[PDB]
């Protein structure tokens, strides 16, 4: 009851860290101490200061003696009673009781006199809005003209079956007996001249007998001409909508190529694993005394995906020209050997589909940056394909059971592209199709835009991550090529080959394997522990860069 | 421990919750245009309405043409000078009114088209007649998509909203109901309706809206009302790209806690189409199903309600979602195949009822929404 | 042009249609008139390829619309003038001086002029009116100044100050420089408005609207991992509350939590640890939840407000160190000094002594409490 009382302040100083923050904390404490800050405000401020330190904040709460209105909010201010007295003639006592007239808010006050940020849209979304703008333009004018034609023809058939002795003094009220006062005025002022529209309106109101039929005839001629122009505009709008709409609805996929070029590099993949290690080491000193021996976790539930990635790799190898043929076959059997040795798949299955710890199931690969980056590219392709496969059956059932509406088939509205040229997914399995298309994209016989359009049409933009499949498998092939053809890098592989092939190893074998791997690489390079389990195919990647030294 | 990540369940109607539906539509409301370059287009109402008729939906409801509001009726919430100015301004005599132009904000954002007073009268009359039909028990659900102008205030026009008809509808509901709950699923904050009922406990205004540097800037979490209306104005700030499952998991617990805590006698539901995906000004990623699950969940409670459509700047998506709302209010689920309407060329390329969500980032993390609904639930303990 | 061809008795005969072609070819939002359709030069890139039933139920509505009027409120319940104001230096609607190239706001004049009750003839500014009165007045200025001085005998020192401001045109009040220069944090905006250290630098038009689609300043539309990493140090921005940096992995970008930095102390905070839903790109500078407030309200149990003093430049500001250490009633305006072993044990013994003092205070009272009940 004494030691924590005298050590609380400098223990809190250690916790706050930054002196500055400690300076403002002492300012908060003095402001409470000078009968200026209320105790609840001090409590909240310390809660914002020592929130994660529960024990310290709990001690502060009970030692201080806290026991658990007028919150106006930031976006409302109070008017005086002078501006409240503004006559609203329709208000009885209930509206004067329940309506707020003193507290107001404005967008200008909420912006702090700075403005607002509009949401960014694609250029395809912008031209979609332009198409919608022109559609509303044509349809609003046509429907307003049609309503005026209906009213005028009602007046005309009322005036046709009557005689001429009272047709001279027959008049029309404003609005022409309709529920609107201005729609016919808008139509008249648009169709006729600006200065003559008003006098036509006056001639229609005073003498409708002569003015009404010629007005109806003009309006009908303008209506049929506008509808013909609207239909042969609607052809253009429909084709541009079919060209634009699915690209407009794609948001991450429109910029996924540059984002995948920028973020699937060595630096970002090192940054992710180092950030996870930094988070674990930062939260280790606070709680969780059993610190985990892993940072990244990868699951591998499906094994056919490995054969798909291998098929894509050999397709890129056969297609490419920058690599020699011995280098091509070394890439092929290096990838096949690494996949057969790291995981539980044998070489036969690959070929047909395209303190002594005895009988060990956990296998450790100690790697430098090159093997780690190559493995990260492989896991990137695996997760990208597994996202497609895990939803392959549902999207296949959706594409196969695509019942088109009847009036689009009768009036050939639906698009024909992605069909004549065979990019729809109807009649085939969706995953196989993707791989086939991809292979075609890798081989160069398929354009990038049509591949992206087919993927976003088939998967409803959920296959945006596969737009750069060729680039990532090219980078994976390049990383394997630099993996076997670099000094102090292929020897680490060979050491992994010896460790995996020779089972029934003790812990000291793992330690001497670790320092033998470290030997090949510099004392500055990064160590990666890639742990594989034969059961459940879980891969745990641990960052031990400059740790074992 | 409040927020739970729940996948989006398919929409199922309740056959034991049949409601008499009164739908309000004036045929003139489609013949008003805000401007040449303007996003607010009342024309989107009638191709919503043409989707109702063509879906035969009308049969399942009672169609009414509400009497347009007059000046005095309008002055039940707004001032006399603002309603006068609205009834007297035209694009012709704009140079006669510059002081009122800056005074009431009419101009620019809220333009001056010559059918302004008639459009506002149609909207206000639809709202007040729906509230009247709810008061007299002639219907259980009142539908009026011509209104929804939730940004209008006492003496100003903002957000493409001139007359706050929702305030008049809630006022008419207050003459027969002691407690009224207004729910705003528009992507914008319902600043006019919340400001109108900020200091009262008779109206609770819950607004699920995007709160960033977005319009209108109000609707921050600490805004809970002052005076007698303290903890009677719930604001739910959301980030960009909230999808159907996330929106369901924030909407359903909050609205459930309001029902079992505030216990309203009537419900007003602002069905903003700007919260849909692909919207011109909205920044949410809601599909039609995600927009419709809120209306189905609030229909499951059995409280007399009034569904009033507000925003929405892409006409096809808001029309399809309003048709699906109106179909859901008759305890049916419309098939995803459009019948032939006159405006059939809008809904390309698949010509189906579904509004497809975009594949943009659901940046609303579970921790942030858990904190937001924890603060909301803590504030809701005082509404008994 | 003789629209209604009336007869000799005034009876209507036939009207002639006006010039429909006067505005039949007005450009719509499509870029073409409504009379014609699209041109070929947009049909190349609009269409995919350019080589150079009526069962409507929508006409039955009017039969089934019943009117609704059942509401309770039914029935009744030469030189060109400047583009800126000469008084406030801001744009807007102006009244222009005729014989003077200065223009004023309608509200900026003495007296302010109604925008509907304009002067019928010519309007001059106060400086121009003074010039015409002097030109008109035979007496030289100094003669009129002296006559005003002797006429206003009751006030002599302000007589020149009273006289010379009739010549001055009305202007918006602006604080003088020596009022503003003593506070270095206080700046002046573009319109002359107040600005201080709690104000952001206004972002130029390039940053908001002239950026790419993927890179938006809101930082909500894409996965940007170059925000958890310090630019000048290269380390990771550890959030203060969660003590973590949720960078994500670009294969699961939903695991990445957004992080900002405070605009004063650069303390990084997650957007979920502090309840916020934006990055405060424009407006006031965001302040982390860790700073001390410059304005507080306390309940009297009315209320009492407290505001921190503004920063003052080193010439007019002096910092003093109290002689009294314990109980010095400062105003809250405080500055901390660095620390220069026996203090810890002295504190320890002081807390110890005071604690048995508190214990004996409790004991000497509770005995009286239990001895009260027998009587």
């Amino acid at each position: 009851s004494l030691n924590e009382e005298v050590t609380f302040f400098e223990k809190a100083k250690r916790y706050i860290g930054n002196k500055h923050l400690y300076t403002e904390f002492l300012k908060i404490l003095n402001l409470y101490s000078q009968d200026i800050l209320d105790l609840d405000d001090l409590v909240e401020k310390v809660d914002f200061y020592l929130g994660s330190n529960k024990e310290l904040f709990t001690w502060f709460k009970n030692f201080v003696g806290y026991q658990e209105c007028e919150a106006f909010g930031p976006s409302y201010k109070r008017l005086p009673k002078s501006d409240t007295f503004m006559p609203c003639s329709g208000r009885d006592d209930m509206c004067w009781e329940v309506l707020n007239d003193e507290w107001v808010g404005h967008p200008v006050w909420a912006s702090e006199d700075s403005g607002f940020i509009a949401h960014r849209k694609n250029q395809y979304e912008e031209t979609l809005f332009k198409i919608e703008e022109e559609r509303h333009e044509y349809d609003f004018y046509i429907e307003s003209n049609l309503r005026t034609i209906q009213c005028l023809e009602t007046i005309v058939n009322k005036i046709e079956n009557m005689t001429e002795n009272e047709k001279a003094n027959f008049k029309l009220p404003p609005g022409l007996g309709h529920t609107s006062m201005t729609i016919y005025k808008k139509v008249i002022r648009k169709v006729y001249d600006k200065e003559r529209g008003f006098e036509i309106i006056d001639a229609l109101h005073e003498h409708p007998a002569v003015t009404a039929p010629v007005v109806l005839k003009r309006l009908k001629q303008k209506d049929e001409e506008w509808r013909r122009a609207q239909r042969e505009w609607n052809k253009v709008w429909r084709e541009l909508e079919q060209k634009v709409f699915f690209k407009s609805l794609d948001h991450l996929g429109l910029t996924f190529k540059q984002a995948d070029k920028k973020l699937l590099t060595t630096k970002q993949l090192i940054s992710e694993i180092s950030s996870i290690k930094v988070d674990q080491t930062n939260k280790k000193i606070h709680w969780l005394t059993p610190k985990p021996k892993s940072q990244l976790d990868f699951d591998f539930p499906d094994k056919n995906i490995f054969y798909d990635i291998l098929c894509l790799a050999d397709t890129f190898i056969t297609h490419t020209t920058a690599y020699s043929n011995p280098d091509k076959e070394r890439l092929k059997d290096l990838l096949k050997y690494f996949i057969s040795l790291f995981f539980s798949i044998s070489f036969e299955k690959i070929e047909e589909s395209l303190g002594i710890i005895q009988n060990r199931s956990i296998f450790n690969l100690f790697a430098n940056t090159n093997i780690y980056i190559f493995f990260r590219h492989w896991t990137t392709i695996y997760e990208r394909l597994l996202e497609i496969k895990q939803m392959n059956e549902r999207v296949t059932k959706e594409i196969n059971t695509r019942s088109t509406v009847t009036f689009a088939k009768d009036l050939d509205l639906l698009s024909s592209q992605l069909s004549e040229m065979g990019l729809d997914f109807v009649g085939e399995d969706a995953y196989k199709q993707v791989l086939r298309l991809s292979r075609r994209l890798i081989n160069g016989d398929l354009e990038h835009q049509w591949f992206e359009e087919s993927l976003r049409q088939a998967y409803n933009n959920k296959a945006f991550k596969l737009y750069t499949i060729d680039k990532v498998t090219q980078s994976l092939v390049k990383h394997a090529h630099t993996l076997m053809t670099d000094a102090k890098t292929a020897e680490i592989m060979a050491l992994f080959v010896k460790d995996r092939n020779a089972s029934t190893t003790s812990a000291k074998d793992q330690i001497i394997y670790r320092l033998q791997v470290r030997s090949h690489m510099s004392n500055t390079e990064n160590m990666f522990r890639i742990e594989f389990d034969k059961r459940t195919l879980h891969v745990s990647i641990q960052y031990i860069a400059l740790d074992d030294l | 421990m409040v927020y739970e990540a729940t996948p989006f369940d398919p929409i199922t109607v309740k056959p034991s919750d049949k409601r008499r539906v009164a739908y309000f539509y004036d045929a003139d409301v489609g013949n008003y245009a805000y401007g040449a370059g303007h996003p607010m287009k009342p024309h989107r109402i009638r191709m919503a309405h043409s989707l109702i008729m063509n879906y035969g939906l009308y049969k399942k409801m009672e169609i009414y043409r509400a009497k347009p509001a007059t000046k005095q009726e309008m002055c039940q919430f707004h001032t006399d000078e603002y309603i006068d100015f609205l009834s007297r301004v035209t694009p012709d005599n704009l140079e006669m009114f510059k002081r009122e132009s800056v005074k009431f904000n009419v101009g620019d954002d809220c333009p001056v088209f010559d059918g302004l007073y008639e459009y506002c009268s149609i909207s206000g009359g639809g709202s007040m007649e729906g509230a009247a039909r709810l008061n007299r028990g002639k219907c259980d659900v009142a539908v009026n998509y011509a209104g929804g102008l939730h940004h209008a205030k006492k003496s100003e026009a903002s957000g493409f909203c001139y007359l706050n008809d929702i305030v008049l509808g809630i006022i008419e509901l207050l003459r027969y109901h002691p407690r009224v709950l207004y729910i705003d699923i528009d992507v914008h904050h319902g600043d006019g309706v919340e400001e109108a009922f900020y200091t009262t406990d008779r109206v609770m205004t819950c607004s699920f809206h995007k709160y960033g540097e977005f319009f209108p800037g109000t609707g921050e979490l600490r805004d809970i009302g002052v005076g007698a209306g303290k903890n009677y104005a719930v604001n739910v700030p959301l980030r960009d790209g909230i999808d159907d499952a996330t929106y369901r998991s924030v909407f359903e617990p909050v609205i459930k806690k309001i029902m079992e805590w505030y216990q309203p006698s009537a419900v007003v539901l602002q069905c903003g189409g700007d919260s849909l995906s692909g919207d011109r000004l909205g920044c949410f990623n809601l599909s039609m199903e995600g927009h419709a699950n809120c209306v189905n969940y609030v229909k499951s409670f059995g409280i007399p309600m009034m569904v009033v459509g507000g925003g929405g700047y892409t006409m096809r998506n808001v029309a399809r979602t309003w048709c699906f709302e109106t179909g859901l209010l008759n305890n049916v689920v419309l098939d995803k195949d459009l019948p032939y309407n006159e405006y059939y060329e809008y809904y390309g390329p698949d010509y189906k009822l579904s509004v497809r969500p975009s594949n943009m980032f659901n940046v609303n993390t579970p921790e942030y929404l858990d904190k937001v609904m924890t603060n909301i639930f803590a504030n809701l303990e005082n509404t008994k | 042009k003789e629209l209604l061809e009336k007869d000799s008795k005034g009876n209507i005969i036939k009207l002639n249609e006006p010039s429909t072609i006067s505005e039949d070819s007005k450009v719509s939002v499509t870029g073409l008139p409504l009379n014609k359709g699209p041109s070929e030069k947009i049909k190349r890139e609009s269409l995919w390829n350019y080589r150079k039933r009526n069962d409507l139920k929508t006409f039955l509505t009017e039969n089934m619309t019943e009117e609704s009027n059942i509401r309770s409120t039914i029935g009744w319940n030469d030189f060109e003038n400047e583009d800126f104001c000469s008084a406030c230096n801001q744009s807007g609607s102006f009244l222009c001086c005729d014989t003077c190239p200065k223009s004023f706001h309608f509200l900026c004049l003495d007296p302010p002029i109604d925008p509907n009750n304009l002067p019928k003839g010519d309007w001059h500014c106060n400086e121009c009116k003074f010039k015409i009165f002097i030109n008109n007045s035979m007496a030289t200025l100094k003669k009129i100044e002296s006559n005003f001085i002797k006429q206003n005998n009751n006030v002599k020192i302000f007589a020149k100050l009273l006289f010379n401001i009739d010549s001055h045109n009305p202007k918006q009040f602006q604080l003088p420089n020596y009022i503003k220069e003593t506070f270095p944090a206080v700046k002046t905006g573009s319109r002359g408005q107040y600005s201080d250290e709690n104000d952001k630098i206004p972002l130029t038009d390039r940053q908001l609207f002239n950026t790419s689609y993927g890179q938006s300043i809101t930082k909500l539309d894409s996965y940007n991992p170059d925000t958890h990493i310090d630019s000048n140090s290269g380390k990771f921005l550890i959030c203060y509350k969660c003590n973590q940096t949720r960078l994500g992995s670009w294969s699961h970008p939903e695991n990445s939590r957004l992080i900002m930095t405070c605009d004063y102390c650069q303390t990084p905070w997650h957007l979920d640890c502090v309840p916020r839903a934006s990055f405060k790109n424009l407006g006031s500078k965001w302040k982390c939840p860790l700073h001390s407030p410059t304005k507080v309200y306390k309940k009297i149990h009315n209320y009492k407000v407290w505001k921190k003093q503004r920063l003052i430049n080193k010439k007019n500001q002096l910092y003093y160190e109290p002689l009294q250490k314990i109980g010095y009633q400062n105003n809250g305006n405080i500055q901390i000094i660095p620390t220069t072993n026996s203090i810890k044990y002295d504190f320890f013994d002081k807390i110890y002594k005071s604690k048995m003092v508190q214990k004996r205070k409790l004991f000497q009272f509770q005995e009286s409490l239990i001895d009260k009940l027998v009587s």
């Binding site: 967008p107 200008v108 | 101009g107 620019d108 | -």
Partner: peptide, 19 residues
């Protein structure tokens, strides 16, 4: 009395939904 504008009727268009 000669008058001239600026021609925006409202104010702070920047703080609006459509500017």
């Amino acid at each position: 009395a000669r008058t001239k504008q600026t021609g925006k009727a409202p104010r702070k268009q920047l703080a609006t939904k459509a500017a």
